């Protein structure tokens, strides 16, 4: 299971189980830069459970190498995650 690097903003739609990594999360307080998901079985980031929950990027601790390691699992065509900036 290799973590595939991606850049923000990032979203994914549909079923499957995927491993992604990024170093692009906000580390300063910004309630506009968030992660959200729905209809997932699992969304874990650095061992923290965010499955189907809204969280600001700055609330998610990085790993000790400065990356965020994301494990996604969904079983539906409308399973979804997004990691992005609030448009307003």
Is 23 near Ca ion (CB under 5 A)? yes
Binding site, annotated residues for Ca(2+): 7, 23-24
CB of 35 to Ca ion, least distance (A): 15
The residue from 24, 30, 41, 44 that contacts Ca ion (CB under 5 A) is 24
- Looking at the Cβ atoms of 8 and 40, the one nearer to Ca ion is 8
Is 41 near Ca ion (CB under 5 A)? no
Spatial distance between the Cα atoms of 51 and 80, rounded to a whole number of angstroms: 10
Spatial distance between the Cα atoms of 38 and 5, rounded to a whole number of angstroms: 22
Q: DSSP characters for 57-86?
A: GGGSPPPTTS-EEEEEEE-STT-EEEEEE-
């Amino acid at each position: 299971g290799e973590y595939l690097e991606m850049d923000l903003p990032f979203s994914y739609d549909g079923a499957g189980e995927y491993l992604w990594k990024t170093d692009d999360f906000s580390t300063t307080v910004d309630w506009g830069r968030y992660v959200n998901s729905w209809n997932l079985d699992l969304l874990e980031i650095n061992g923290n459970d965010y499955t189907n929950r809204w969280v600001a990027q700055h609330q998610v601790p990085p790993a000790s190498d400065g990356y965020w390691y994301i494990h996604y699992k969904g079983s539906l065509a409308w399973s979804h995650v997004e990691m992005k900036l609030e448009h307003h």
